[PDB]
Amino acid sequence: IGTGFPFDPHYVEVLGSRMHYVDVGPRDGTPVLFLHGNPTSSYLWRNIIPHVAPSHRCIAPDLIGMGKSDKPDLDYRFDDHVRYLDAFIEALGLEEVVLVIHDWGSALGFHWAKRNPERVKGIACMEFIRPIPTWDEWPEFARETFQAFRTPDVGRELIIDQNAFIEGALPKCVVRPLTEVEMDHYREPFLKPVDREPLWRFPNELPIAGEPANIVALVEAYMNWLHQSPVPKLLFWGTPGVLIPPAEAARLAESLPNCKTVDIGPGLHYLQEDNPDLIGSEIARWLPALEHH
């Protein structure tokens, strides 16, 4: 699995900040917009984009406060991310898109799609955010840790002061071992502890056991939309998974319209790190039939 990031930087000014993004591939056509989550960046997509770029434009932003994007002093709540990403998409003049989404990138992507349904030609998703109704529906192995993250004292100690999301949660949710070169790419945006605010706010925003209520409601709303939308969907899943265990993937296969599911083999949360070649090649193969209006 490749460790390099062979993409030229691009920057756009959004809401007073520069956001970094990958932009490769043909200029015409329907662009494919790749949205990472916590605590990652466009680096997460590095081994997937090369499968898609031969046929389609690939755009992969670093969310505000993350990657090579600027670091304004925000709370980095979901609503902040929504505002910056909405402004990013408009700054690039995107019209119709295909979304490729993961984790908080999937909350952003599904929420954008619900609001802009006529502009989404397809959604490829993996390990995406849905409401987790009770803590029993969160995987046992990660329960005590995420409960600790979701506190005002201990969670900040762990995530901000000790870098637990980068040094602990990230590699623990890749089946294969991440290399030190990979870890350094993930560490780079967060070398200064104070810059880790988004990494703590994100787990505190996850819709778990009814909290926070605003995010539960928003996520319920985009899931209701997804269940009734004809948009083509491509869902990748792994075993045992984290957010989307195998039995849930199977239920979604049958419940979501026009949904293709792909088993990637072993996987926890960062599926892109375990089987990027299958994810990329399946996305590439799936794109052409989406084009016709």
Side-chain angles (χ1 to χ4, degrees), residues 18-224:
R18 302 193 307 181
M19 289 179 71
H20 172 257
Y21 61 106
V22 175
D23 188 356
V24 295
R27 309 296 303 153
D28 51 356
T30 306
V32 184
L33 179 64
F34 295 79
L35 301 177
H36 74 84
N38 190 35
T40 66
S41 70
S42 61
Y43 187 77
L44 184 62
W45 301 115
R46 70 196 180 283
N47 297 315
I48 290 166
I49 288 168
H51 290 266
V52 177
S55 66
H56 287 72
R57 185 174 181 195
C58 296
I59 305 170
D62 292 342
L63 298 182
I64 196 64
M66 306 186 78
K68 300 175 198 184
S69 292
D70 285 349
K71 298 184 183 295
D73 183 6
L74 306 180
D75 288 338
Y76 293 99
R77 296 166 184 273
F78 181 68
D79 317 79
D80 293 314
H81 288 288
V82 167
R83 270 197 310 120
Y84 283 78
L85 184 65
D86 276 357
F88 173 87
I89 290 169
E90 295 313 304
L92 267 61
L94 305 184
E95 299 177 355
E96 301 176 323
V97 301
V98 174
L99 294 172
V100 178
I101 64 189
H102 179 229
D103 185 60
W104 284 100
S106 76
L108 288 164
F110 289 135
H111 183 59
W112 189 91
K114 180 202 76 181
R115 292 177 298 135
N116 295 275
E118 79 290 356
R119 290 167 68 189
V120 178
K121 299 197 62 83
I123 306 175
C125 60
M126 58 211 78
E127 279 285 314
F128 68 84
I129 291 172
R130 300 188 298 183
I132 303 292
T134 68
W135 278 107
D136 292 333
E137 283 83 81
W138 188 264
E140 178 174 79
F141 85 99
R143 190 176 298 139
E144 188 177 313
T145 293
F146 270 70
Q147 290 170 333
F149 290 174
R150 294 168 56 103
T151 64
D153 47 346
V154 172
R156 296 186 67 80
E157 169 188 359
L158 292 171
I159 294 171
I160 297 167
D161 294 335
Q162 298 166 20
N163 216 13
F165 225 110
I166 288 292
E167 299 292 351
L170 166 62
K172 283 186 186 306
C173 293
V174 179
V175 174
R176 68 150 184 116
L178 294 177
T179 74
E180 271 283 292
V181 166
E182 292 169 324
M183 288 297 296
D184 283 341
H185 277 99
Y186 286 119
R187 285 161 179 152
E188 190 172 79
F190 302 113
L191 297 173
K192 298 199 263 161
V194 63
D195 294 340
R196 298 164 191 168
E197 197 69 26
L199 310 189
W200 173 86
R201 181 55 72 173
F202 271 143
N204 281 276
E205 293 280 74
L206 284 164
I208 304 168
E211 168 71 22
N214 67 317
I215 305 302
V216 171
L218 181 152
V219 171
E220 285 171 332
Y222 68 62
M223 290 306 301
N224 291 337

